[PDB]
Design a protein around this motif. Sequence first.
Motif, PDB file in Angstrom:
ATOM      1  N   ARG A  24      60.370-103.153  57.170  1.00 14.96           N
ATOM      2  CA  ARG A  24      59.190-104.017  57.196  1.00 14.96           C
ATOM      3  C   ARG A  24      58.118-103.416  58.111  1.00 14.96           C
ATOM      4  O   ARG A  24      57.616-104.036  59.041  1.00 14.96           O
ATOM      5  CB  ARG A  24      59.555-105.461  57.566  1.00 14.96           C
ATOM      6  N   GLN A  25      57.719-102.177  57.804  1.00 13.81           N
ATOM      7  CA  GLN A  25      56.716-101.472  58.588  1.00 13.81           C
ATOM      8  C   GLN A  25      55.311-101.809  58.119  1.00 13.81           C
ATOM      9  O   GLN A  25      55.073-102.107  56.942  1.00 13.81           O
ATOM     10  CB  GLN A  25      56.954 -99.955  58.523  1.00 13.81           C
ATOM     11  N   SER A  26      54.378-101.727  59.062  1.00 16.11           N
ATOM     12  CA  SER A  26      52.967-102.026  58.844  1.00 16.11           C
ATOM     13  C   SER A  26      52.149-100.839  59.312  1.00 16.11           C
ATOM     14  O   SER A  26      52.591-100.093  60.173  1.00 16.11           O
ATOM     15  CB  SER A  26      52.547-103.280  59.622  1.00 16.11           C
ATOM     16  N   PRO A  27      50.932-100.681  58.778  1.00 13.22           N
ATOM     17  CA  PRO A  27      50.292-101.532  57.782  1.00 13.22           C
ATOM     18  C   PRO A  27      50.832-101.249  56.389  1.00 13.22           C
ATOM     19  O   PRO A  27      51.718-100.398  56.215  1.00 13.22           O
ATOM     20  CB  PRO A  27      48.822-101.119  57.877  1.00 13.22           C
ATOM     21  N   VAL A  28      50.265-101.943  55.400  1.00 16.99           N
ATOM     22  CA  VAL A  28      50.595-101.733  54.000  1.00 16.99           C
ATOM     23  C   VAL A  28      49.308-101.792  53.193  1.00 16.99           C
ATOM     24  O   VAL A  28      48.279-102.305  53.641  1.00 16.99           O
ATOM     25  CB  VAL A  28      51.595-102.777  53.442  1.00 16.99           C
ATOM     26  N   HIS A 104      45.407-101.572  57.370  1.00 22.22           N
ATOM     27  CA  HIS A 104      45.625-102.140  56.054  1.00 22.22           C
ATOM     28  C   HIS A 104      44.559-101.622  55.111  1.00 22.22           C
ATOM     29  O   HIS A 104      43.477-101.216  55.528  1.00 22.22           O
ATOM     30  CB  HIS A 104      45.611-103.668  56.111  1.00 22.22           C
ATOM     31  N   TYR A 190      52.123-111.267  54.993  1.00 22.15           N
ATOM     32  CA  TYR A 190      53.393-110.634  54.751  1.00 22.15           C
ATOM     33  C   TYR A 190      54.100-110.377  56.088  1.00 22.15           C
ATOM     34  O   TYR A 190      53.469-110.404  57.092  1.00 22.15           O
ATOM     35  CB  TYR A 190      53.247-109.326  53.960  1.00 22.15           C
ATOM     36  N   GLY A 192      55.818-107.947  58.777  1.00 20.27           N
ATOM     37  CA  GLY A 192      55.627-106.540  59.086  1.00 20.27           C
ATOM     38  C   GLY A 192      55.959-106.219  60.519  1.00 20.27           C
ATOM     39  O   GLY A 192      56.838-106.845  61.122  1.00 20.27           O
ATOM     40  N   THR A 195      51.864-101.755  64.515  1.00 24.76           N
ATOM     41  CA  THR A 195      51.466-100.518  63.836  1.00 24.76           C
ATOM     42  C   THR A 195      51.388 -99.311  64.766  1.00 24.76           C
ATOM     43  O   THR A 195      50.948 -98.237  64.332  1.00 24.76           O
ATOM     44  CB  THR A 195      50.106-100.675  63.151  1.00 24.76           C
ATOM     45  N   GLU A 201      59.640-104.692  64.474  1.00 21.99           N
ATOM     46  CA  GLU A 201      59.465-105.488  63.261  1.00 21.99           C
ATOM     47  C   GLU A 201      59.463-106.981  63.595  1.00 21.99           C
ATOM     48  O   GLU A 201      60.393-107.735  63.300  1.00 21.99           O
ATOM     49  CB  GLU A 201      60.526-105.101  62.245  1.00 21.99           C
ATOM     50  N   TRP A 205      52.054-110.809  59.629  1.00 18.31           N
ATOM     51  CA  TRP A 205      50.685-110.383  59.464  1.00 18.31           C
ATOM     52  C   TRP A 205      49.883-111.379  58.653  1.00 18.31           C
ATOM     53  O   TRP A 205      50.322-111.858  57.605  1.00 18.31           O
ATOM     54  CB  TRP A 205      50.623-109.009  58.807  1.00 18.31           C
TER      55      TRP A 205
END
Length: 257
Positions: A24-28, A104, A190, A192, A195, A201, A205
């Motif tokens: 569940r890493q960010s950003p996306v 993002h 979501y 996340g 960053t 995690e 977000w």
Amino acid sequence: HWGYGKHNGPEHWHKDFPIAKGERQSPVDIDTHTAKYDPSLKPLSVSYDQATSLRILNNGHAFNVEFDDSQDKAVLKGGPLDGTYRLIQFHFHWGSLDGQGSEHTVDKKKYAAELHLVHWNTKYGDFGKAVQQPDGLAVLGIFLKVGSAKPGLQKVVDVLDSIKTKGKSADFTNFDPRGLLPESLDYWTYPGSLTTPPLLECVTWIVLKEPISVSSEQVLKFRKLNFNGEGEPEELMVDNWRPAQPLKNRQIKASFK
Ligand SMILES: Cc1ccc(NC(=O)NCCS(=O)(=O)Nc2ccc(S(N)(=O)=O)cc2)cc1
Ligand SMILES: [Zn+2]
């Protein structure tokens, strides 16, 4: 240690922080045609009237405006959130060029910068406990595009000369963060991560659909900051953003139809 250079940038982070390759890493990237409207989402409640900003800090990767989070003074609630999340600080991520800078992205679109208003869940008692919890943080993400000036950003812009280099801080009281908000609070959400390292995690977000406009002169002054400390070789604090990470087994929900 870690940074955004070609020898210590995002592609290197996994060696010290293996969660960089996590689930569940960010950003996306926010694919607007795949995000589903979720009618059970509640409206966001941004309660910033009693916010108490204290200080602005250049920490060598970005600049943070810090607030008093020892009481419920500036809190985010509602939306996907259960409970009350206190604002601890906000910072930005920005580019060297106007076509890049956000973390993002929206349908692969990169904005010039991205504001992160960082909140922690009061049920965990302090920020350091909250980052160890899957529902520990709520970060409100707001895109910046270059156009008209943003009046409520200008006091931020005008203090940056005093925190040019890493480790410099300046008094920054009575700053009013609702002046950085767009008109609409329509959002995607979501689960996340932070960053930047440690990439924990722990973040719900909440990314606002409507960007804010800042002037070219405003973002130019972000780009005059330095990653380095005073008396070290000057490296301009630009492009301090992590690129989009795999969405994996996550769905991004939209609060709007
Ligand atoms: C009075 C006061 C109020 C706040 C503070 N500051 C903090 O605790 N600041 C930073 C939290 S942090 O863990 O260290 N890192 C971090 C946070 C967000 C993100 S992001 N990029 O995902 O949003 C990435 C990394 C000091 C005094
Ligand atoms: Zn951030």
